[PDB]
Scaffold this motif. Sequence first.
Motif, short mmCIF file in Angstrom:
data_model
loop_
_atom_site.label_atom_id
_atom_site.label_comp_id
_atom_site.label_asym_id
_atom_site.label_seq_id
_atom_site.Cartn_x
_atom_site.Cartn_y
_atom_site.Cartn_z
N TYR A 136 3.71 30.57 -19.72
CA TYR A 136 3.81 29.84 -21.05
C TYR A 136 3.07 28.63 -21.16
N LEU A 137 2.94 27.73 -19.80
CA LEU A 137 2.41 26.63 -19.63
C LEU A 137 1.52 26.55 -18.59
N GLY A 138 0.28 26.02 -18.99
CA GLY A 138 -0.99 25.82 -17.85
C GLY A 138 -1.59 24.54 -17.93
N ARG A 139 -2.21 24.19 -16.95
CA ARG A 139 -2.99 23.11 -16.89
C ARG A 139 -4.21 23.29 -15.58
N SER A 140 -5.22 22.37 -15.82
CA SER A 140 -6.29 22.64 -14.96
C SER A 140 -7.24 21.76 -15.29
N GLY A 141 -8.13 21.31 -14.25
CA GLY A 141 -9.45 20.64 -14.66
C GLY A 141 -10.86 21.66 -14.12
N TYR A 142 -12.05 20.91 -14.44
CA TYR A 142 -12.94 22.12 -14.16
C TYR A 142 -14.08 21.26 -13.77
N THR A 143 -15.19 22.18 -13.08
CA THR A 143 -16.46 21.78 -12.53
C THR A 143 -17.43 22.62 -13.30
N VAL A 144 -18.33 21.86 -14.00
CA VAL A 144 -19.42 22.70 -14.72
C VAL A 144 -20.73 22.71 -14.06
N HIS A 145 -21.49 23.59 -13.89
CA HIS A 145 -22.78 23.63 -13.50
C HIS A 145 -23.68 24.41 -14.18
N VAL A 146 -24.83 23.67 -14.70
CA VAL A 146 -25.73 24.35 -15.56
C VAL A 146 -27.14 24.63 -14.67
N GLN A 147 -27.78 25.68 -14.73
CA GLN A 147 -28.82 26.03 -13.87
C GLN A 147 -29.84 26.56 -14.85
N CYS A 148 -31.11 25.90 -14.67
CA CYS A 148 -32.35 26.34 -15.33
C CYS A 148 -33.53 25.83 -14.72
N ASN A 149 -34.52 26.70 -14.19
CA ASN A 149 -35.52 26.66 -13.31
C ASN A 149 -36.85 27.00 -14.12
N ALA A 150 -37.95 26.30 -13.79
CA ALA A 150 -39.06 26.44 -14.68
C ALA A 150 -40.32 26.05 -13.60
N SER A 151 -41.56 25.91 -14.11
CA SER A 151 -42.62 25.47 -13.31
C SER A 151 -43.04 23.93 -13.61
#
Lengths: 264, 264, 60
Positions: free
Chosen positions: B93-108
């Motif tokens: 019924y109850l929850g808690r958490s933090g996060y680590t977000v990683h965004v990936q985008c590669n080009a030339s």
Amino acid sequence: NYTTINYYKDSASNAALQLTIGNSTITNSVVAYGRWPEFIRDDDQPTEPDVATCRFYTLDTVMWGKESKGWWWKLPDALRDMGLFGQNMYYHYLGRSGYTVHVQCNASKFHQGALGVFAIPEYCLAGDSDKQRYTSYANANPGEKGGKFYSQFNRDTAVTSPKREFCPVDYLLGCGVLLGNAFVYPHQIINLRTNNSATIVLPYVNAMAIDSMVKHNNWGIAILPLSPLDFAQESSVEIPITVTIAPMCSEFNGLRNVTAPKFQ
Amino acid sequence: NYTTINYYKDSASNAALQLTIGNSTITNSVVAYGRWPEFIRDDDQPTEPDVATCRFYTLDTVMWGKESKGWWWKLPDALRDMGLFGQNMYYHYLGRSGYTVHVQCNASKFHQGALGVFAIPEYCLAGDSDKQRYTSYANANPGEKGGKFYSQFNRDTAVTSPKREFCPVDYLLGCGVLLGNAFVYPHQIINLRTNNSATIVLPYVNAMAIDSMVKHNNWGIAILPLSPLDFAQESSVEIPITVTIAPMCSEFNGLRNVTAPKFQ
Amino acid sequence: FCGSMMATGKILVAYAPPGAQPPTSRKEAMLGTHVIWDLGLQSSCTMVVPWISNVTYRQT
């Protein structure tokens, strides 16, 4: 004293009340081999749900009458679909756990009967055909429902579509040994004139510190009526029997994708 | 100095590199508000999967072209179907958490473009109809797929069967505020001529120490192209964008039967 | 990796312990042990498969 000197370099060559667990509570107990469940010793990080998996789960109730011959279950097979314990089982390659088994059966002072509960390590059962070790995985892992004993050996005379099922016999314990000696295993007796419940604590027993929980069952539970049920001068009598099992000190390792066995 | 004496008894009356988590590894980072995720302080036993839930999960890849206007996701909504994290969410019924977000985008080196990634607490979006706060639960919780922004407000002129969907606008950030000020929130910029990835660490933010994870989303992630994508003198250009999120210091409480929301 | 210096990309190398279906997609593979390798920054990658078994010794 006699003189002896070992010549070879190799050793082989040498001559020779209320119990509460997690969020569950149930209101004397027997400890198998006098060994309480414990985690792996000091001698890949294991995962251990302290309370999400170590709690009492209740199975389906069964009915005991004047013709019942017995029931059997396999662990950890019976708990494969119980909360997060099953999820951890099927999300990991290696698992380990002990158990606490509680059997409930209540009656009146005018009833009579006796039940024997036996916990068996490596409980291997016999088949129902001339072919040897031909039983299938699905039939050998009934799950919560479990199986039943029989008073005689019924050979499956069908080569077109063999059933590939066990054929346990009550007085042979389903494995070719006399039932009277089954008390060698950890056991309890429920006599309706003295008590109404039984409790057993099972540690982890195996030749390896940890092993797969999907292809190998560590424990078997067998319940058999030592004395027939009766009540006053009534022709038919039926009473319920309930089983509740709690995992204890459970560890898992080898996280990968989920396993989905084909149960029929 | 001036003299002052408080008369009333009440206070109100008074005058005023590689990062490894669990069994996952990814090869500068930004910490939101300079606060690392942490467990609840000293001031019902919570359940805490140390490694079965604190690990990197990868979402579905999206495509960035010359007409893309942006993407958005909601947390913890996006991880509702990721391993045991979702099971713990729906079994408590109850929850808690933090996060680590990683965004990936590669080009030339011959590509050009800039992406802005924003982490927004209590990210509330606008509707697509005259009726106010009429958006439905299913449309407000897309999940892994997420949603997209638009360059204009398209009113849903259908009273027979209203869609009840969001209508975010890119330059209004979908909430009636100018995009240029969105940098007030924790943010990162991915410029293809300097870098190819972004990282943000989000602690738990809410008016309560712990809250339901099913009816309330604590974080929103928004990705918008600040500069259009281009490549040499080509008419069409498309490159992939990937998002990977890791829960951190997650706690759950209130174990009961499982919750099964009706997502369409 | 034996490409040109102008090539770039990323790879995922995964190990899965026995017991379940062999992985057929990245979604299944990423649930087991895995490493992400960037070709542009590094031309070589190393992955260590640790010893995880029920028996103390395995047959050849």
